[PDB]
Amino acid sequence: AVIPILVIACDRSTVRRCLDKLLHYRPSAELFPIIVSQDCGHEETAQVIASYGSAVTHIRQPDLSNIAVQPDHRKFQGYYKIARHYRWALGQIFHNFNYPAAVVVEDDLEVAPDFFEYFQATYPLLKADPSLWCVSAWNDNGKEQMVDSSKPELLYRTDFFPGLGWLLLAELWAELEPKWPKAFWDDWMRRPEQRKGRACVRPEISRTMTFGRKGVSHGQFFDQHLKFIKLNQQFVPFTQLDLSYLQQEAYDRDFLARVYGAPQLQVEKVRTNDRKELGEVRVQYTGRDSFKAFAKALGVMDDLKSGVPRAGYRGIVTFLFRGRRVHLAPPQTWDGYDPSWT
Numbered sequence: 001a002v003i004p005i006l007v008i009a010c011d012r013s014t015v016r017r018c019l020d021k022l023l024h025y026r027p028s029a030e031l032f033p034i035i036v037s038q039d040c041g042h043e044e045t046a047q048v049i050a051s052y053g054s055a056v057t058h059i060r061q062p063d064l065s066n067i068a069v070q071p072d073h074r075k076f077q078g079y080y081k082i083a084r085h086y087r088w089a090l091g092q093i094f095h096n097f098n099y100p101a102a103v104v105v106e107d108d109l110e111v112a113p114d115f116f117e118y119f120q121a122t123y124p125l126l127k128a129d130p131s132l133w134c135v136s137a138w139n140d141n142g143k144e145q146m147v148d149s150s151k152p153e154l155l156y157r158t159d160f161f162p163g164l165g166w167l168l169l170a171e172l173w174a175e176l177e178p179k180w181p182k183a184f185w186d187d188w189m190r191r192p193e194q195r196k197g198r199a200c201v202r203p204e205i206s207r208t209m210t211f212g213r214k215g216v217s218h219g220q221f222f223d224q225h226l227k228f229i230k231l232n233q234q235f236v237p238f239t240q241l242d243l244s245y246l247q248q249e250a251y252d253r254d255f256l257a258r259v260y261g262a263p264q265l266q267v268e269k270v271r272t273n274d275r276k277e278l279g280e281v282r283v284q285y286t287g288r289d290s291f292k293a294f295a296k297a298l299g300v301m302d303d304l305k306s307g308v309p310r311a312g313y314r315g316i317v318t319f320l321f322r323g324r325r326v327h328l329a330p331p332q333t334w335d336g337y338d339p340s341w342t
């Protein structure tokens with residue numbers, strides 16, 4: 001099937017690094033056309049994109065006017081511009097070019113060698129399982145010491161929409177466009193009114209990496225977390241693997257049985273590396289305070305969006321800690337997310 005890569009650009013000439021990697025790894029120009037939508041009108045960036053010639057299709061957001069923001073958002077004009085550009089660019093992909101799906105890539109992302117193979121293999125899963133609403137290349141807890149380098153092929157389901165290199169179907173754009181927000185589009189997608197309990201597929205080792213230290217948002221999140229996400233460099237032939245384990249019926253039975261069948265260990269024991277014979281354990285949290293405390297003790301992201309933890313699935317955050325597989329999980333009685341967990 002034909003899956004365009006939609007690159008979102010504005011005023012950073014480093015879109016060059018993004019395009020160089022996409023073009024280098026692309027296995028087929030026909031199956032993966034690259035459409036670069038540029039906002040802002042930055043001349044140098046426009047010239048950089050134009051220099052690729054027919055290797056890409058350069059389109060330009062037509063409305064470069066300032067946006068009237070609400071009273072609580074004087075400092076956030078850039079976020080309103082991002083949202084406006086996304087609406088226009090996705091509209092071009094799905095209404096003008098009329099493609100069936102698209103992989104959205106921001107201009108400050110460098111892709112892994114198997115980026116295209118990954119989406120080619122997972123597109124059919126997204127097509128077939130209505131409980132999934134996206135496939136993402138990003139592991140929110142993908143720092144080097146928290147991922148298993150021996151399992152570059154391992155994938156998971158997550159309730160936390162990761163963005164940062166993601167595939168969506170034209171069917172999803174049909175649902176989202178009528179109510180597209182004025183700003184903060186990704187946190188808006190993370191709300192239950194939008195997500196409707198659907199999950200995304202995400203990898204053990206990220207297939208994208210961001211190098212955009214300077215951008216719309218202040219660089220502290222990049223400086224303290226994003227910059228440490230490891231880019232996969234070992235090519236995995238996903239189209240040759242059996243990915244049926246990701247179907248909801250199979251995953252919710254087998255993965256949950258795995259998590260709750262693992263021995264429970266106190267957070268302190270995991271921290272100090274006690275009982276190393278247990279290569280896979282569960283650390284149980286029972287409230288917002290314990291979740292935050294335990295996540296911090298083990299070095300994983302502790303923030304929540306609409307009550308959902310980073311890379312969480314049914315409240316479970318899975319990662320590696322000093323070589324051990326750890327599932328930070330709620331009691332098995334878990335029955336939904338609580339948006340008040342902030």
Ligand SMILES: O=c1ccn([C@@H]2O[C@H](COP(=O)(O)OP(=O)(O)O[C@H]3O[C@H](CO)[C@@H](O)[C@H](O)[C@H]3F)[C@@H](O)[C@H]2O)c(=O)[nH]1
Pocket residue numbers: 008009010011039040078079081082085086105106107108163164184186212214215216217218
């Ligand atoms: O005027 C503009 C300025 C930038 N853009 C584009 O929006 C995209 C994100 O911009 P940028 O990378 O600078 O912002 P970022 O600091 O990562 O955080 C935002 O993006 C994050 C998600 O990746 C999100 O969590 C956060 O709330 C965002 F602020 C990128 O592709 C730009 O080219 C645009 O179309 N028009």
Ligand SMILES: [Mn+2]
Pocket residue numbers: 106108210212215
């Ligand atoms: Mn960025």
